[PDB]
Symmetry: D2
């Protein structure tokens, strides 16, 4: 399932992020912001049940309860996901948090075509309850999806109820590469960019979210 959250509010922030004349304080702050907005979108897609409450004037009345806000396992993909996951926690307070690190298998002869043999050098995920939890992998940029797919490779094994992916900008290539392989995946993103260059950088993109937000 593809969800392209391109409303005015989100395209407004996305524009600020794109703009290179946007300093670090603002670039970082916008990541957190979207995190909370896309965090809200995913919320309106989670499993909920109808409940009954009793108002003050004593009137038992129906209501909704997103019981699944109790089964959230967010997975922070360093280094740029951090700020994104910050805003995500504002929507999923009850989430356990996984941390993952991945590096392109250092080749030597610049090759990044469709695959840069990614490799995990850090992994710390809480227990994922099979067919119960809703895993949410966060990473602002999905370019060649080498990273994402490598992370998924491991998550899929846990067999959680649902698997969500939250990115700001993902590439034409990267979105199809993922969904074709894992069609049951709920992929949320704000914009889907046409192409990526021969270095794996997304175009038009927005530069390096990691350095833009940290350095």
């Amino acid at each position: 399932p593809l969800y392209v959250i391109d409303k005015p509010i989100t395209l407004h922030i996305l524009t600020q992020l794109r703009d290179k004349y946007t300093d670090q304080i603002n670039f970082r702050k916008n990541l957190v912001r979207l995190g909370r907005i896309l965090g809200y979108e995913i919320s309106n897609t989670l499993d909920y049940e109808i409940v009954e409450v009793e108002t003050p004037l004593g009137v038992k009345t129906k209501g909704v309860d997103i019981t699944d806000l109790n089964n959230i396992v967010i997975i922070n993909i360093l280094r740029a996901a951090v700020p994104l996951v910050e805003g995500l926690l504002k929507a999923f307070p009850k989430a356990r948090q996984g941390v993952i690190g991945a590096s392109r298998v250092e080749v030597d002869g610049k090759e990044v075509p469709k695959d840069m043999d990614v490799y995990i050098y850090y992994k710390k995920i809480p227990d994922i309850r099979a067919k119960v939890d809703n895993v949410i992998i966060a990473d602002p940029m999905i370019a060649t999806a080498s990273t994402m797919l490598k992370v998924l490779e491991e998550v899929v094994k846990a067999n959680p109820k649902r698997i969500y992916i939250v990115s700001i900008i993902s590439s034409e290539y990267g979105v199809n590469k993922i969904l074709s392989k894992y069609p049951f995946i709920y992929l949320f993103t704000v914009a889907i960019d046409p192409e990526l260059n021969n270095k794996g950088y997304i175009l038009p993109g927005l530069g390096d979210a990691g350095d833009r937000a940290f350095g």
Copy 2:
């Protein structure tokens, strides 16, 4: 224009607010929360223009810019709007803030039928630019709309570009009373309750938002 923002996320919070076993910290915090969510809805309805930005890799590209986030005049209707306006400011940072106080013309013989001759005892609004600003009157509860209409009576005179109304719960009666009189009004609300009793209290409602949030 009526906008009933009844998505799962908003009906979820609304349910917590309804529930009388919800303490003050949480009841108040949920008002602020919705304020920011309904603040986001109104944002996706504001006038924006297409802009062009230059990414880092040097790619001039299109984007949206809600220029109207610059022309916002929020109007806080004491006493319960305060918390609501708190979250609203998180969506409209550039807004000037009006403060208003209204009291039912103290009669003596309990009468609240369709009108309780409301009266303004406090008023402090910034300058409202005719046909430029977008006025946003905030008040969680719209019951008989005596208060709202009394406030509008004064705002309409300013002749702003648009006029929005943000309420959590508004009554069948109160919504129609307002829109029939002022059809051009963008009325945002989460739920619209069937009826109000003979004291002007909304049913099923959620009790007194003012005392629930303050006392």
Copy 3:
């Protein structure tokens, strides 16, 4: 008890507030900020008890518990206290909130000397438990103290355990006028300005906090 919280961090923000080239977003945001900082100062003066907790490795160990964070009644003095009280709530989540409005008894012949016969036109305070609660009246500016003293006049009657006053800038005159009358009062403030002019405006002051923050 006078507490002049003039540390670098607070004098830094106070300076920004003083500066007239500080827009509304920043001026307002700094009020909230100080609110939370002065909110922290008052916290280190509240009654607490020593407690014992059991760490994970199973080690019962001592700790402090500011039990009095449970007995807080904040009193928001319109119109400028609002933003200040916003940050104050971030330190005292468990506080009930009073709202008060006061106006100089509209004379005609500009007189503001030592007294401008203030008058309350709005009042909504929760129940204040005698000798239990710690009342905290918030108002960024204490000039002639006509407002403050008028508000206190009513609060003193409740006979709460303690009474705190949180202001950003208070005048030489206003501070002494209050403490001399009510010596048991814990008055917190960042700076105490030399004098106020013949209109009741503080000098050097920082202008109208109300219009600076709202309009």
Copy 4:
């Protein structure tokens, strides 16, 4: 320079963190909280200059300006520092952010005495301006200081103006091991615990801040 920020407000939160009956939402939230409080302490120790501003009524007047809030390089030591650094950013918005990962040189024969040959497997620090920046390394727990010293080993090389260390709980052993080696270091911490066991765990401590906050 040792700074033990053991005020009631900080010992209050520290107590909640110690307490094993404190869930994840609250344990994590308290880390962020302290981050902002200890972030404020360090602020009152930074180099500032006296400035002059012009109030509204037109009165040039003195003020303080912590110019050094412009030269902050925070260094997040995974995995627990994340939440701590979250609150730290609320005090140092203008900071560049370094990320570091360290692992005990996997031996085989449980030995952790005074040194567990630590090893860095991840490092991404922005440029540190020699004798200009104020580096702030964040890590809630300083036990044997193997991690801290290993991180410092690299930071010292940059020769920044000042080097701060922000921890919640640090051990008798770890504090002296660091300051003896690097006496010019400004070490901030809330509590200093007596001893650590033979596994490197602090006593009384508060358990694993990483798993307490993430899993």
